[PDB]
Each structure stands twice: as C-alpha cells, then as structure tokens.
Amino acid sequence: FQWQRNIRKVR
C-alpha cells in the first residue's frame, strides 16, 4: 500500500 503523502507509518 504505497502511501500517497509522505506518511510515517500505518499501525
């Protein structure tokens, strides 16, 4: 799941 905006992580 390639995050859209430079995100940290999806816990």
UniProtKB/Swiss-Prot annotation:
Residues 1-11 are annotated as: Bactericidal and antifungal activity. Residues 1-11 are annotated as: Interaction with lipopolysaccharide. Residues 1-8 are annotated as: Interaction with PspA. Transmembrane segments: none annotated. It comes from Homo sapiens (Human). This is Lactoferricin-H. Coiled coil: none annotated. Residues 8-11 are annotated as: Involved in glycosaminoglycan binding. Changing residue 9 to R: Decreased antibacterial activity against Gram-positive bacteria; seems to reduce susceptibility to localized juvenile periodontitis; associated with increased plasma lactoferrin concentrations and possibly with susceptibility to coronary artery stenosis.
